[PDB]
# Entry
Amino acid sequence: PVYIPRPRPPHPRL
Amino acid sequence: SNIIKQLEQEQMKQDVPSFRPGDTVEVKVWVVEGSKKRLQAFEGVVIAIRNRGLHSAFTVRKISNGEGVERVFQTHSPVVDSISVKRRGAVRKAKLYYLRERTGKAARIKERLN
Amino acid sequence: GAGGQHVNTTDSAIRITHLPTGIVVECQDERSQHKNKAKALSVLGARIHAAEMAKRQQAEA
Amino acid sequence: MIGLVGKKVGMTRIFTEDGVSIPVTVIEVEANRVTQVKDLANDGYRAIQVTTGAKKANRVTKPEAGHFAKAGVEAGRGLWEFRLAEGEEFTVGQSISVELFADVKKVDVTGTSKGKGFAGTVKRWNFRTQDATHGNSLSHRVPGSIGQNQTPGKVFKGKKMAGQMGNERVTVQSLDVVRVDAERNLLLVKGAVPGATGSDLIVKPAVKA
Amino acid sequence: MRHRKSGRQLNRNSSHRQAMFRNMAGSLVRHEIIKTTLPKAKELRRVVEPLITLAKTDSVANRRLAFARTRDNEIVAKLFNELGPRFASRAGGYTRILKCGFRAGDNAPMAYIELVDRSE
Amino acid sequence: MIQEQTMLNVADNSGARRVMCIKVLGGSHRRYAGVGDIIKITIKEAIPRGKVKKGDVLKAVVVRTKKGVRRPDGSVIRFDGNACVLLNNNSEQPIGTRIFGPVTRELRSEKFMKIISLAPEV
Amino acid sequence: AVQQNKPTRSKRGMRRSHDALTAVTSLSVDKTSGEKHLRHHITADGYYRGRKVIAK
RNA sequence: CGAUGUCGGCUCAUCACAUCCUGGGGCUGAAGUAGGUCCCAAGGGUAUGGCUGUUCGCCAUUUAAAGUGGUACGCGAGCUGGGUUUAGAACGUCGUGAGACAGUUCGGUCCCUAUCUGCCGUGGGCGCUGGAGAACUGAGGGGGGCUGCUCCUAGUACGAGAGGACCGGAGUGGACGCAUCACUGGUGUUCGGGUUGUCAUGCCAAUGGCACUGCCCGGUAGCUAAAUGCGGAAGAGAUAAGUGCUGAAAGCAUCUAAGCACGAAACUUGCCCCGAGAUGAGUUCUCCCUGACCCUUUAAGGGUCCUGAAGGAACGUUGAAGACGACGACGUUGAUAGGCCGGGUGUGUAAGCGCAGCGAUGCGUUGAGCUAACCGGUACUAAUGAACCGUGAGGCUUAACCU
RNA sequence: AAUUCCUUGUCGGGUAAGUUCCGACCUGCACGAAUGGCGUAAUGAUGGCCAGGCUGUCUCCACCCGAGACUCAGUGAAAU
RNA sequence: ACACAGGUGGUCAGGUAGAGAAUACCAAGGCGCUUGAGAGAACUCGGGUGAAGGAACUAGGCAAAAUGGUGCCGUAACUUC
RNA sequence: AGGACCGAACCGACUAAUGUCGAAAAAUUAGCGGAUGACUUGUGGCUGGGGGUGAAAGGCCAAUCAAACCGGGAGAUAGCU
# Structure
């Protein structure tokens, strides 16, 4: 695949 | 069933006065006043008649001293003693539940007068 | 208040209630509860002391 | 004493002469003839085996037809085995009328219930509906959490979950009997007994006296 | 959970289903044999049958009730002229299901439902 | 079916006009009161010369419900407005002198016998 | 919600052990015609219980 | 650290007992009522609101009581996202400054169609040794178990009064649970009526469509609950803490070492439910099957012909049974379904015609007409003769019986 | 107080009960006068609170109408 | 990227009710959106109604529900009038 | 008259629900703000990467921005895996 989307953001944890 | 209808019709009293909804109806209910069997009169405008034979019922609205009261009656009950017609209302609807919203001058009804 | 994952889990806040007087004091200052507790025993001691000295000094005048 | 297999015939109510009204269930209870008095000889325990009702003879099976014409009793619907109580003692073919419930005053009617089907947990185990607004997503009736975490590591056996509700066999207990009729073969018991009209109610005198 | 309920739904909302029974009752009355699916047949009995029991008694009012259903005048004119006095002494059941296997495109059980007639 | 937060008119002439139920007595996690149960109210609206005032936390007892009470024959007696009679928290003996409107015969049980003589009906 | 490691040939076959198709085995020989039809369905020509009904 | 979603709430729980209540005791600075404290006991029970994102807590008012805890201070492949944990902005403050704060304020994307384990239901195969239709036995397993108030004893014991019991009983509520639609109600977009706008059937009249069922008013069957019925138990066995009796060691003393009694909501049993896959696969009752030929590798073998039994399955009409299988009723010698007839309920004086009214409309016909799922009936339509699987008297050993 | 830590400061009002709210005091950790001070009618998809209405948000869910789910036929992925 | 519930400027603009190019039903005209059939479970989505109570829910009346048009009477503190 | 009011087109995007391997790499449905203006829009220009433009968010500059994309220095360097 040419377009690989940005991964779904992580659960915070900070 | 045959069984329910025959066990039912052997307890329905055969003298029930016929009244339409909208009549002014005076019902007499027995009452235990301690050790006494008093016969009380509750009288107003009849606004609903459930019919199921033995399980038939009718509801009487009566604006008593302060506000409206609605007492529903099991017709074939032994505690009821008399059902008497006073007036005959010319309403044109089976269940007269509009009358809860109306008081006084607005809720006065017509007579059948036939 | 603020802290992050530390606030969400560690307790680090203390009420001390002097029962015969009914004077609580809640100290919620720092991250460790010990330097909240020693403070909540210092200010508790000073409030038993000043709330008594107003009874004695109240009964002077 | 023994119980009596009857049929549920709806519900009505009977007005007492003094003023109250009682909701009764009418149970047509025909003759419950014995097809087999079991005793301690070939069974170790003693019991009876009754039947009632009727079938078409081209609908009854050839094993069961021999099982009924062994006793000579007319092949009806079902068989129901009742436990005996060492004092009363029946014989094969001895018909049992509705008149065992004269002197008794409490019964335990057992019938196959009314199947509500695959009910979910709110209707089945009386769980509580979650908040049906305030952010809620796709989760208004679902049963919530079912276990704890890494330490239990499984769901416990007997967790209240969703599934088949009703069409079980239950037992209403200790019903005050109202009126027993001879020629009509009716047993009036107070209050609801399980199952819809046409069920097969086994009615025995109440064990909790 | 439809304990003792009746009335198939046939994957349609009510106002649609009333209209396919209003159309298909007319098309049955006009053609005297039709090929529809088996549940639509077994609910088409309960629609078409009282339209004929209404037609067995001819008057002014029954014409207007049988026009309030079927909404068409050919249908009410083949009733009260032809079909009614063909069932002048049939005590109900003017209808017939005949299963015709399955539909080709979607494997749906067919049925020729027809009038108990066509005695040419 | 008088439960918590329900507004009730006042039957008698004690001095309140509109009282709010705050707590139902006689059980743990009880949901609602009924025919003639003792409840705990505060007062939302007083007449000026009354014996009670606004905010005055006391016990009432419901005497009329729009849900209605059921007679044993299978009747029901629905009123057209909920109401109560104010009582005294420590001795119930209701504070009002005379009661406006009807009451219902189940209230005749060894502690409201003062009410059904002050009542005009039923 | 996804498989931790792939299943085999074996546990696929045992799940597919209920996808067998069922035979019909009820084919009537029609009264008049001798034709084969299912129980309670009309024949291919159209005779049903011997009686012609399709007229088609 | 090639990610172990972190506070509180919601839903759901589950165990421990260091027991909050209920139950049994000891001591008391125990007169009574009420307490204090300690021992045994986990069977059930264990608030509703205001404030704060809050846990916690303060308060209001209850209660029999408002238990302490483990479960990733249980539970986000279950919900939320108020605080906390980004990016915007500002206040105080610190820094010359970008910026910064367990300092404060306002705004701030919470994904997953479940393979395996588990759990709730519900099926197919085969076993149980000849097959089949049922009826149970009960190993085991589960559900259940809460408590108030009023009254009698009695205003007796107790007390100077003040107040105010033990033990045994009876009625009635609260919370929870089971069942049901007979009542009271919800619903009832499948029934009846009203009515707005517009379109249609040539037009009036009449209905019909579409407008969230157009908007509403009533409501049959069903399901339902706020509604109505019932439940927890009584008892029995063995006990814990405890109380004894007899009784030496140890002339006395002692509930114990020998011996015998009592003693709790806990345990076993009693109540209800699942239940012989209880492979240890059980018991009873019934019905069913008794043909010949030939090959061998003469084996509980294979194999040909004639038969197909009880039964089941399939198909059809279906059901107060159901996701699907399943389960129950019926299949013409028939009421299983539809239709039809009579009823019932519901709605409420149809159309048409007549009269009155200039007309909107009113009266007569008329308590009419229409009336779903309901009730008693009725073969009118639809449930076809068969074909299909299942056979042919059931292994070996030992034992007591007849013969 | 968009500033205040101690602190849910003290008193008053609202409420049965108010860490929020409004008014006041001033003990201003650490407001303050164009990095504006104090007010301010109208305005605001702005922040905090209160009341009347209105109601299935809630006590506590119940029933119904549709579209999926489930069954049959046809084509038939994906993460891992 | 697709025979994709998205985006794209101009011109015409009928009837009844309507202030209206809103909105409802229609004409001319064009479509029924390229899987259907069935059952009528849980549970999810989009809706209807609801006894008694009425914010007790909740972080918060979020979401619903309710109010709604035209004429006429009438309208407070405050104000930069 | 009006950076006036209510409200369609039209421009936008405050709220909730759905959607989150969707119909869609930001949408839909019911509400919602502006709607003679500091509006909005068609078509053509113009500004070019330490540069643009910015009613200012480090926003936007071809689904990419605290320094675009493409080719090169280039096989950078990597005490790291």
Notes: The first strand of chain G starts at residue 28 and ends at 29.
